[PDB]
Amino acid sequence: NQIDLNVTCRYAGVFHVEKNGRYSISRTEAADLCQAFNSTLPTMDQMKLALSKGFETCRYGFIEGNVVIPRIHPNAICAANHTGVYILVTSNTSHYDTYCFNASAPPEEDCTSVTDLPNSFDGPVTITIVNRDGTRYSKKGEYRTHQEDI
Ligand SMILES: CN1CCc2c(N)cccc2C1
C-alpha cells in the first residue's frame, strides 16, 4: 500500500508529477493529486509561461483540457521533435502523468525539493514524494476521492 510520486522543479508554479514511474494517472486522479499539493491543473497559458521560464519534459501529462508535453529543445524521441507546448491529438488510452500549478511557488525556476503534500487527507497509503536529486518525504494518507481510481 505504497505510492511513489516523482516531482520536478517548479517553473512559474508549474511542475510535473509521475505516479510510480509510469503513465498511470487518470484525469480524475490528476485533479485529486494536484489538490493534494494545494495545486490545480495548469491552464494552457500557465503552461506556456512555465515553458518560457525553462520548463520542459519528455512525458505526456494532463493540464486543464488537454494532455501535453512542454518542449524547449528539439528531440526526436520527445513529442516527435516539436517545440512549444505540444498537444497530444490521437491516442487510444486515458492514463498519463499530470502537471500541477501551485500559485504560491516562486515566479520563475524553483529547483528546490518538495518536502510536503500539504493537503493530503487521512488514509492508509504510504505516499512518498521523490525528488530528482533523490530526496524523499513520506507520509501516511490518501488523495484519491473517486472509487474507480483506487
Ligand atoms: C523518469 N522520471 C523523470 C523525472 C523524475 C523526477 N522529476 C523525479 C524523480 C524521478 C524522475 C524520473
Swiss-Prot record:
Hyaluronan binds at R22, R59, Y60, Y86. The lineage of its organism: Eukaryota, Metazoa, Chordata, Craniata, Vertebrata. Disulfide bonds join C9-C111, C34-C100, C58-C78. The lectin-like LINK domain is responsible for hyaluronan binding. It is found in: Cell membrane; Cell projection, Microvillus; Secreted. Residues 13-102 form the Link domain. Cell-surface receptor that plays a role in cell-cell interactions, cell adhesion and migration, helping them to sense and respond to changes in the tissue microenvironment. Participates thereby in a wide variety of cellular functions including the activation, recirculation and homing of T-lymphocytes, hematopoiesis, inflammation and response to bacterial infection. This is CD44 antigen. N-glycosylated. Glycans are attached at N6, N38, N81, N92, N102. Interacts with PKN2. Interacts with TIAM1 and TIAM2. Interacts with HA, as well as other glycosaminoglycans, collagen, laminin, and fibronectin via its N-terminal segment. Interacts with UNC119. Interacts with PDPN (via extracellular domain); this interaction is required for PDPN-mediated directional migration and regulation of lamellipodia extension/stabilization during cell spreading and migration. Interacts with RDX, EZR and MSN (via FERM domain). Interacts with EGFR. Interacts with CD74; this complex is essential for the MIF-induced signaling cascade that results in B cell survival. Expressed in the intestinal epithelium.
